[PDB]
Amino acid sequence: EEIPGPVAAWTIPKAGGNFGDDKERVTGGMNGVGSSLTNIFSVMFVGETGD
Amino acid sequence: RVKECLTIVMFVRDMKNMRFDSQTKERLTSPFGEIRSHIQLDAKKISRAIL
Amino acid sequence: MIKNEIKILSDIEHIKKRSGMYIGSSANEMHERFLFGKWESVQYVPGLVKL
Numbered sequence: 001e002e003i004p005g006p007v008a009a010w011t012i013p014k015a016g017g018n019f020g021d022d023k024e025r026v027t028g029g030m031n032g033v034g035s036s037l038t039n040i041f042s043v044m045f046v047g048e049t050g051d
Numbered sequence: 052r053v054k055e056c057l058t059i060v061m062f063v064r065d066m067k068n069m070r071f072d073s074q075t076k077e078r079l080t081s082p083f084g085e086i087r088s089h090i091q092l093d094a095k096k097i098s099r100a101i102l
Numbered sequence: 103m104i105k106n107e108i109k110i111l112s113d114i115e116h117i118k119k120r121s122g123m124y125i126g127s128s129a130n131e132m133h134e135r136f137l138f139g140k141w142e143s144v145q146y147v148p149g150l151v152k153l
């Protein structure tokens with residue numbers, strides 16, 4: 001299925017741009033599951049990303 | 052008994068190849084060679100400055 | 103220039119390349135531990151004992 005960017009980042013786990021090489025990445029993220037973990041335990045949620 | 056009487060405020064910026072052992076992410080399991088190669092902090096300055 | 107290439111690994115290569123995540127400390131280190139009644143300082147490799 002074709003799912004766009006922010007909704008796959010916020011609803012489906014194992015999704016992120018932090019799955020790169022360990023020798024270059026300065027960010028602390030390694031899971032891809034985080035905003036899904038935020039969104040699952042929320043009864044209301046709205047999220048806007050302008051690019 | 053030496054190290055039991057200190058409070059330490061350590062903030063480290065711009066590190067690479069971080070490894071934490073849990074999704075809790077509360078503690079670093081990175082190898083000490085990468086951390087020792089990245090850190091160029093003069094700890095002997097801290098030792099003479101608290102001596 | 104640093105090299106940013108996103109790599110996805112299978113689980114055998116994920117364990118074999120990121121060995122500190124799953125078997126703990128993978129270096130020859132020293133610990134003060136209980137052995138047969140005595141708290142003594144001894145040096146070993148924790149991965150074999152973990153497995």
Ligand SMILES: Nc1ncnc2c1ncn2[C@@H]1O[C@H](COP(=O)(O)OP(=O)(O)NP(=O)(O)O)[C@@H](O)[C@H]1O
Pocket residue numbers: 009010015016017018019028029030031032033034035036076
């Ligand atoms: N609001 C957001 N802003 C930026 N990136 C986001 C956002 N929500 C989700 N993402 C992306 O999706 C991922 C969120 O899941 P998460 O589990 O945080 O992954 P991680 O950052 O790789 N691991 P970790 O931070 O250790 O939990 C991030 O890696 C981002 O790439």
